[PDB]
Write a protein that binds this ligand. Structure first.
Ligand code: HEM
Length: 293
């Protein structure tokens, strides 16, 4: 039923070459700090890594991070991907300096570098995604809608082979960045610390006083008097009793949430890829701070 995508290391490259790419991304994150009203590019890079991987379908191995297909117009213009052009334009000069890295390796490594540089967990990362042609680009409509309930979320993520814990852990990336009305029809940040990776999304779900309101695009979202919001699908994590347990867990254990996020995010970025037996081990890149850079 299933196409095989075998990881193929970019020729002669090793951990040091990819740490250089990581560094170039991390230094540009630091440099281009004004983006999106001084949020910086971290959040949108995490989202680009996710949306370029989250097209995967476990049933037939279509979509997924391997082929780097977001570079093709059908996927770049998915209405679900509105806004990610900013992440892509950010990665352009990185790809020009390191033209030997594949597009899938760069889009996934952009997400890993962003989470780490924003003081999140270390995320092991494996190289070897290989660009595939335009006709392998998955159709629009594989990424999730925001107006739905917990049952939708649970069913949706079964296609990406994620269970409840992985779903709840991945959603904590909504600590980061904001919704922008012109992109998605929702507006506002989920919390205060939105370029530093913490478990604030679960603390705010449980602790803020949320009101169900309509925003200026006439879509419902949950809002707090702190100026934060939650999408219907975020709020569903405290409406469903199974998800709520795991929300309370991560609101109360930052290390657990980091460890679970790191595994789920690595899995998301690797779904669909076959690693040969003698492939290199996953790399754990040092942050700029760890290197004194
Ligand atoms: C039910 C699943 C999800 C839904 C419906 C959803 C929906 C959305 C929406 C509507 C936005 C705002 C886009 C904009 O207006 O710019 C957004 C932003 C964001 N999403 Fe999600 N999301 C989901 C899951 C995830 C996951 C799994 C991750 C990564 C692990 C993620 C990471 C992010 C990040 C980092 C942003 C902020 C982007 C920025 O600030 O530019 N999301 N999401």
């Amino acid at each position: 039923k299933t196409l095989v995508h075998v990881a193929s290391v970019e020729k002669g490259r090793s951990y040091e070459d990819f740490q250089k790419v990581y560094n170039a991304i991390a230094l540009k994150l630091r440099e281009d700090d004004e983006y999106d009203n001084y949020i910086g590019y971290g959040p949108v890079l995490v989202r680009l890594a996710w949306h370029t991987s989250g097209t995967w379908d476990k049933h037939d191995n279509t979509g997924g991070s391997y082929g780097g297909t977001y570079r093709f117009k059908k996927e770049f213009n998915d209405p679900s991907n509105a806004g990610l052009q900013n992440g892509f334009k950010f990665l352009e000069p990185i790809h020009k300096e390191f033209p030997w890295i594949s597009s899938g390796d760069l889009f996934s490594l952009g997400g890993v570098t962003a989470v780490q540089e924003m003081q999140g967990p270390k995320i092991p990362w494996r190289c070897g995604r290989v660009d595939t042609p335009e006709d392998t680009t998955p159709d629009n409509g594989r990424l999730p809608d925001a107006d739905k309930d917990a049952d939708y979320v649970r069913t949706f993520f079964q296609r990406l082979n994620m269970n409840d814990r992985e779903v709840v852990a991945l959603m904590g990336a909504h600590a980061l960045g904001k919704t922008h009305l012109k992109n998605s029809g929702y507006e506002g940040p989920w919390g205060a610390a939105n370029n530093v990776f913490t478990n604030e999304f679960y603390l705010n779900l449980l602790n803020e006083d949320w009101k169900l309101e309509k925003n200026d695009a006439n879509n419902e979202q949950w809002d707090s008097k702190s100026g934060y919001m939650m999408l219907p699908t975020d709020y569903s994590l405290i409406q469903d009793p199974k998800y709520l347990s795991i929300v309370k867990e991560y609101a109360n254990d930052q290390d657990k949430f980091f460890k679970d996020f790191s595994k789920a995010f690595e899995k998301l970025l690797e779904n669909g890829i076959t690693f040969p037996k003698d492939a290199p081990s996953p790399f754990i890149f040092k942050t700029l701070e760890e290197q004194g850079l």
